[PDB]
């Protein structure tokens, strides 16, 4: 059985494009289709993480859990010979990513779409108008930590853009710029100015979290009224319940969209395509992972 | 991997091999004055203030 996917290039690359791709000969990236010859317009995370549209993590996450993944094998002048991963056998990937998180053997490698700036994980090709975005491969505890912290960074930037007397920049930066795992302390590249009215990455996810935990105290009391005293014992102020003034149609709509946003956010908090490493050798930066 | 196994068993009664230190090459330590501090060997102990 073969695994080669030979994407060819229309106009052949310049020398610096080869030089910037050649340093990333070990990274993985999604593919469009699992066919034995492609072209560069379908490649990894370009058509959703582009400049003209608003970028969103939800659609990128659905695309990443949608299609196949592929480490690349060699970069010639006019081709990118690359092998797709299948869950049958295991592969040799490398931690050649620009926010360098030191891996560990028997680590669960999450593949999330890049939130550390578009310019860090990109190869802006000038030969063909294409911006190959490699996804950021990081181990799952760091992944869930950076997801919680940039959700909190986005809601804390929006709450200081809506009002100055709530949150402080000496408060939300020493607490949220620090990702600590296994003694390794990491610093984060965060947007100090995200810009209002959405228009940026991880905005709607914070909005999804806000509307979900907004409608959730309306749902908890409906469930404990439908289902009890141990479940009324733990909250105290939410036990002031007013379920009899709201219409059943509007309450039904709110309950349904609460369940839907809760589900989508919960499935997103599982990090999608999750590789599982065996023996990470940082002498040669090479981990051995398979599709799990 | 290339796996190999060998079985050796002493056929004499007493010690049938010997190993003597012949010539010093270098005193690779310096016989200095450096005590190990007990604040690193017993680190959790402190005083009342």
């Amino acid at each position: 059985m073969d695994l080669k996917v030979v994407v060819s290039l229309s106009s052949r690359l310049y020398t610096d494009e080869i030089a910037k791709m050649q340093q990333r000969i070990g990274c993985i990236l999604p593919l469009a289709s699992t066919h034995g010859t492609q072209n560069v317009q379908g490649l990894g995370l370009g058509q959703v993480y582009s400049l003209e549209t608003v970028p969103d993590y939800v659609s990128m996450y659905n695309y990443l859990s949608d299609c196949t993944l592929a480490v690349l094998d060699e970069v010639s002048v006019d081709s990118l010979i690359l092998t797709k991963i299948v869950p049958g056998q295991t592969y040799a990937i490398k931690n050649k990513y620009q926010p360098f998180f030191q891996w560990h053997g028997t680590g669960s490698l999450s593949v999330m779409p890049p939130v550390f700036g578009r310019e860090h994980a990109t190869v802006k090709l000038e030969s063909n108008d294409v911006d190959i975005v490699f996804p950021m491969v990081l181990p799952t505890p760091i992944a869930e930590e950076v997801l919680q912290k940039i959700l909190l960074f986005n809601v804390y930037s929006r709450v200081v853009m809506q009002a100055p007397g709530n949150a402080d920049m000496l408060d939300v930066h020493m607490h949220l710029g620090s990702v600590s795992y296994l003694g390794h302390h990491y610093e984060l590249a965060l947007p100090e100015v995200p810009g209002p009215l959405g228009l940026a990455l991880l905005d709607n996810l914070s909005l999804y979290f806000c509307i979900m935990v907004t409608l959730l105290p309306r749902a908890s009391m409906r469930l404990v009224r439908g289902l009890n005293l141990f479940q009324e014992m733990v909250p105290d102020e939410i036990a002031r319940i007013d379920l009899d003034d709201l219409s059943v149609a509007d309450d039904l709509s709110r309950m349904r969209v609460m369940m839907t946003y809760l589900q989508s956010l919960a499935s997103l908090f599982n990090l999608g395509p999750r590789l599982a490493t065996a023996a990470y050798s940082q002498e040669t930066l090479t981990a051995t992972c398979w599709l799990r | 991997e290339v796996h190999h196994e060998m079985a050796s068993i002493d056929t004499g009664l007493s010690y049938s091999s010997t190993m003597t230190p012949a010539r010093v090459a270098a005193i690779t330590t310096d016989m200095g004055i450096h005590t190990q501090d007990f604040f690193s060997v017993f680190p959790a102990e402190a005083f009342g203030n």
Binding site: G88, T106, G183, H184, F230, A276, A278, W290, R292 | -
Partner: protein, 321 residues
Amino acid sequence: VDRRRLQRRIAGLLPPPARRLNISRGSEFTRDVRGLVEEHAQASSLSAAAVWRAGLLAPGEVAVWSGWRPPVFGDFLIHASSFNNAEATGTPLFQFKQSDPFSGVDAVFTPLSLFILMNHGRGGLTRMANLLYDSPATLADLVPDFGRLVADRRFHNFITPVGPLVENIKSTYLNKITTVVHGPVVSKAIPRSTVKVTVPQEAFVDLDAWLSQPCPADARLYVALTYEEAGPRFTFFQSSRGHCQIMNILRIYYSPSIMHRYAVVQPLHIEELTFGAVACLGTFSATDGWRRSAFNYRGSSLPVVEIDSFYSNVSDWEVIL
């Protein structure tokens, strides 16, 4: 483009392993049934015709498709003090994630060795637990802060199962275990023998027997670190369900202990709300599984459940509440 070149190449590409053979009589043992039943082994003596006949130089899979993948190993360098070399060849290990950044020597834990972490931070299991590992402080220091990790209930995301051991080469100071982290647990030895996962009996419950319709083909082995009020316990669970069903079954199983933990201590702090975690270790055949036997050390012998023909597949930690 020439047809005669492609035809001979695809004639190497095409013909599959024989998926059926219509036997005329089951005592002839002809060449065809030999070609069906012969399986290529992963070991050979070092010669020319020996590797040319056992076929070690074939790429991808050994031949002179069938779902037989070679397992991926995990080789771990530990002290000789945390791992009793007379422990069984098939026991599931638990590597602790050490806070030291460039460690190089880690901390693994047999569930026999994992008992005294629970019981010296404060039946048949306690006797062999103190017998196989005589000093509880030589493991209570490998985890640096067991009391704080059990205090903030972050002890399951620090422990990753690496599956069962396969070979434990005895060295004097720094010991090299090799476990199978994912795949079919077969022995790496020249007389190739079957290796069974030897889990202690008291640390095991059969959950199919705890309920006491459809008979599936393969059942999964689950472990369950849970934060009791008496310290943690590493209970094993055997079941033939998925993860997403067996977590509900575990919620049913520990629903008394949830009310008991709320009755013994009010979770005034945030971290005292979480309760336990489950993670699968892999699959095995549900019919001939989990026969019992005993394990002989010098001063005692506790009962031990043996699960044979294991397929190791470690899964991640899932909170139960």
